[PDB]
Design a protein around this ligand. Structure first.
Ligand SMILES: *[C@@H]1O[C@H](CO)[C@@H](O[C@@H]2O[C@H](CO)[C@@H](O)[C@H](O)[C@H]2NC(C)=O)[C@H](O)[C@H]1NC(C)=O
Ligand SMILES: *[C@@H]1O[C@H](CO)[C@@H](O[C@@H]2O[C@H](CO)[C@@H](O)[C@H](O)[C@H]2NC(C)=O)[C@H](O)[C@H]1NC(C)=O
Lengths: 540, 540
């Protein structure tokens, strides 16, 4: 007969076929391969997004890599010898606008390291899940945790309260704690502490957070800029129409004096030319492409949008180029002209530090990660077990124990390689809908990730207006959880609204969670006291 | 027979009782009075909120009221005569921080004028509705239109693109157009142009906008401040820990130079002492009070929260005082020591100007108002007609014609007195639930508004941390519209999300509407073209 039939029969009757229980689950070999291909096509946008987001945090390097500069910018630093010409020693301000050249070079090196680390963590997680749990699930660094890790815990170019290495240690300890909790069966009971309205709306809140990042110049397409009155207005003017802000001291007559050592922002204020940014309109075109591909059920919509926007930007002498006519642009183009490369992680691997373990901020991060991974992983896996028909009458699908242990182990391993926590992707559903039932789907996704490695030069050249619409559409899709909040009941509607709006406005996830929980406790104090009084016996 | 029974019988058998159809609708006199009292108690927060919001726009006065200042702030301006001491002529920067004393005095005068105008517009609208339509509905200046009029169309202290008088003319013409449209029966047809997902989510969007205003230092309790990296972080530090920002020019070596004539912001950047602002915690206490009063179905919850927070602030030598130890504070206290006053509108009444009618921004405002009033009034009235049992099998409740004409006339009259458009309040439902069926409820609310006049000194002394939680809770209650969007369908979910998130982030309502409509058209182009091709006959 057909050669595929012979191959399927041979594999099913073999020893590895019985190991993976192919016959008992009604799927042979090619259904597994097709399901793995579909899942990889649906989740491949993480390869660009995660590396960009994590690289924005600055990585391991610090002020020690800034180089001394000349008195005038027109003279090369090594030729700054003459009357009144001296070398300026670097300070913290070298990390921020205008950025010192050495810092930017290090940041590019960190970006390559983080691409490789993302690929390796996804591969190891998928293989561990496939071999141990024997489930068709794919693991990769999560999205909300990426944004929270980069822009809040560590901050832009290390402007946060915790260094990169200490945050890696926090992720490591969180993974170990999650493993220990899942191994003794206290995970389900611990999941009950979070009140219901906070437990749901939080997801929506994160989506809003992500969307806001996509509407930002540092991070996405623009369209939102600084305003002296309202703090936020309509941006998206060309890069030559933007200026920075600096703190000043005023008086009661009208004088102003610049404040020494103050933080200078990026080019966030727009003077003229609104709605004229070419990169903004290129990002809009990519957004439209992804949205149409999502409506018509095309797999890999985000891949297509990102690839279109990136390929348009690879030309050199345009207004939307990714390789500007500078030294950094020329170096980036030179690395890009190499199509394939085998990059070895140099700075990011094995970069843990336990110095800040006694700080109060550290723990605020460690708990927050622990919350998200406990909820998300609990929410996703069971949902997946419903699509594959594994759930019995008791609500258990056998391999849940090893599924949770494998997720925790993947988190630990990813922390060792220098990336944000890894989780199970919801996109795995698209593989289950195609017929994947065993762990061969995870192995197939792992092989695809291995082949996605070796393309670091192509993945390291993706501009900010290409990582923009994917975040917005991810927020759109996360928004669907609001339909199960009872907005008629104030005692539920107030905490959910507080969580949802505080996540993007304070630009933090922990603050939204804290506000929601505090509001819930305050609003339920009276009822709890009345119940306690009735129970004790002072009241009827 | 009790005396109340005799009074009810006498009124019901009288001529005015037959005029208002008291007997035919099963309500006599005291049910009408009680329903009016309940409605007024539920809607009385507008008396403070609307005046504060509209006064933040600066009113009619301009740079011409700034007074010349001395070379040093320590010398009184009229004694600035000596070596090198001159008078600085005012410029536009006198309107912004630091604010010229004459401008602040004028703004206080405008605040009194706007309190009186708000009361008068509400009274006239209620009387016109009660006498003509004969419905138990109360009219007052709307909330989203207040915020849009003040902070977007006119801008803070006149920093927008349209002056106050031109915006009043826009409101006037919008009211006239709405009257003409409703009189010829094209209102229902015109209401169908807005796509459904935009037509719903817009309400939720406005709520978010309002909540953001309540989390702002200019406008509410604080908690959200400027950030050099993310533009927005956790504020709410004491007023002595805040500094301003000014635009600068950088170079490639590290120098910075202040830019001449740039806009200086308010005290928005926080250096230290986060979560230590006493006014922030007072606002939180007021928020909690209103939240419990809302949970337990207490009428006038917002009144109680506002009154508590305001009464705490009336003491003079504290950190939460509304009368600081300055000249402006002393003048405010002197006006407050008067309990009752008869204020006559001096600047705001009859201040229309038709100069900017050929500007493109003008029309962008005029349409936007016209949208909101067409939707909101259509959404509310019919809903009210369901609670009172007026809707027949055909969907009409007889007096809808005069109801819409009365709403339009009230809009025009309010525009003449110098306020944002007036609409029907949803809070009127609380009066219908109590038994109100005729127009005597509107007359009762009008009498209550008339007696609420004469208390301008008390209403003019309400601080910003008292107008804060009401806006947040109004946003919470408007948020309930999201449950009727199908978030599973991308072709609907994308426009709704775009509208909802663009309203508060760009800090404008028109931009959210434009984005939503544009996204809807773009996403439906392919389907519309395919349908048209099938209809014409080129396709099967
Ligand atoms: C960096 O280079 C600029 C010149 O490009 C220096 O600016 C001097 O000081 C102000 C501010 O720009 C200018 O008005 C002067 O014209 C500049 N003087 C000269 C001789 O160019 C700036 O001083 C340099 N940075 C430092 C720390 O010296
Ligand atoms: C306005 O008032 C200040 C004093 O309050 C005057 O003095 C200046 O103070 C700032 C610091 O706040 C210094 O940077 C300036 O060097 C001071 N200038 C002088 C001449 O002493 C200030 O001069 C006043 N401004 C004007 C235009 O008169």
């Amino acid at each position: 007969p057909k050669l595929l039939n012979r191959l399927n029969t041979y594999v099913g009757s073999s020893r590895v076929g019985k190991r993976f229980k192919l016959a008992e689950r009604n799927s042979t070999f090619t259904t597994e391969l097709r399901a793995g291909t579909a899942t990889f096509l649906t989740m491949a946008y993480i390869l660009a997004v995660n590396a960009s987001i994590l690289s924005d945090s600055g990585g391991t390097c610090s002020v020690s890599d800034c180089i001394p500069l000349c008195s005038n910018p027109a003279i090369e630093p090594s030729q700054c010898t003459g009357p009144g010409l001296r070398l300026i020693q670097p300070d913290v301000s070298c990390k921020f606008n205008p950025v010192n050249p050495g810092y930017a070079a290090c940041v590019e090196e960190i970006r390559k390291d983080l691409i490789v680390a993302t690929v390796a963590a996804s591969l190891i997680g998928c293989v561990i899940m496939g071999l141990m749990a024997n489930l068709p699930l794919a693991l990769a660094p999560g999205m909300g945790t990426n944004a929270y890790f980069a822009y809040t815990v560590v901050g832009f170019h290390g402007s946060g309260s915790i260094s990169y290495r200490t945050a890696l240690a926090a992720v490591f300890i969180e993974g170990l704690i999650f493993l220990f909790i899942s191994a003794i069966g206290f995970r389900a009971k611990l999941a009950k502490l979070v009140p219901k309205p906070v437990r749901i709306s939080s997801s929506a809140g994160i989506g809003l957070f992500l969307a806001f990042i996509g509407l930002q110049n540092n991070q996405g397409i623009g369209l939102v800029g600084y305003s002296p009155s309202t703090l936020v207005t309509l941006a998206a003017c060309p890069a030559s129409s933007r200026i920075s802000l600096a703190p000043v001291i005023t008086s009661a007559n009208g004088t102003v004096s610049l404040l020494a050592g103050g933080s200078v922002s990026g080019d966030i204020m727009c003077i003229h030319g609104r709605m004229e940014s070419p990169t903004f309109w290129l990002g809009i075109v990519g957004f439209v492409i992804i949205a149409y591909c999502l409506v018509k059920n095309v797999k890999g919509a985000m891949i297509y949008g990102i690839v279109f926007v990136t390929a348009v930007s690879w030309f050199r002498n345009t207004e939307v180029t990714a390789f500007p006519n500078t030294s950094a642009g020329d170096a980036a183009h030179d690395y890009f002209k190499k199509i394939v490369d085998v990059h070895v992680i140099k700075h990011t691997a094995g970069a843990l530090s336990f110095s800040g373990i006694n700080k109060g901020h550290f723990w605020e991060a460690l708990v927050t990660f622990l919350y998200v991974d406990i909820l998300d992983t609990t929410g996703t896996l069971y949902s997946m077990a419903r699509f594959a028909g594994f759930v019995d009458e008791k609500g258990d699908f056998a391999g849940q124990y090893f599924a949770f242990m494998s997720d925790a182990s993947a988190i630990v391993i990813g922390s060792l390689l220098g990336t944000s926590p890894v989780t199970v992707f919801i996109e795995s559903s698209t593989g289950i809908r195609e017929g994947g039932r065993t762990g061969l789907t995870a192995i197939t996704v792992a092989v695809y990730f291995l082949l996605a490695m070796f393309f670091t030069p192509l993945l390291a050249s993706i501009p900010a207006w290409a990582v923009g619409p994917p975040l917005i559409l991810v927020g759109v899709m996360m928004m669907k959880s609001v339909t199960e909040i009872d907005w008629e009941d104030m005692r539920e509607a107030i905490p959910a609204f507080v969580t949802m709006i505080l996540m993007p406005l304070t630009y933090s996830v922990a603050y939204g969670l804290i506000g929601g929980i505090g509001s819930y406790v305050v609003l339920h104090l009276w009822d709890w006291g009345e119940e306690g009084l009735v129970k004790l016996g002072f009241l009827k």
